[PDB]
Design a protein around this ligand. Structure first.
Ligand SMILES: *[C@@H]1O[C@H](CO)[C@@H](O)[C@H](O)[C@H]1NC(C)=O
Lengths: 48, 50
């Protein structure tokens, strides 16, 4: 069972993580039933 | 989820994921109706010593 919990916070700090408390609401309960041992995030390029 | 209790309109503001609610003692004191999404308190039926 792949559980996605999510939270969006309006912040204004420049560099590091803000210091505070924010609980993550459950977003998606996903029925995959597969083995996961490694992950990789996806970025977006800018072309000019 | 079966039970017996007085259903009253609730002042609790359930979040969208949250379906049923637990009290101080972790008993189901509030429930969300599956047809009309409203919150109802479940006070137990009056108990007395005769
Ligand atoms: C059917 O149930 C959904 C939620 O489960 C609700 O939004 C909708 O109003 C209901 N429709 C009727 C006709 O009761």
């Amino acid at each position: 069972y792949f559980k996605i919990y999510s939270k969006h916070t309006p912040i204004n700090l420049v560099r590091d993580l803000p210091q505070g408390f924010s609980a993550l609401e459950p977003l998606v309960d996903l029925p995959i039933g597969i083995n996961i041992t490694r992950f990789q995030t996806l970025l977006a390029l800018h072309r000019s | 989820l079966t039970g017996t209790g007085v259903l009253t309109e609730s002042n609790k503001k359930f979040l969208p994921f949250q379906q049923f609610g637990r009290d101080i003692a972790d008993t189901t004191d509030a429930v969300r109706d599956p047809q009309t999404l409203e919150i109802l308190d479940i006070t137990p039926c009056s108990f007395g010593g005769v």
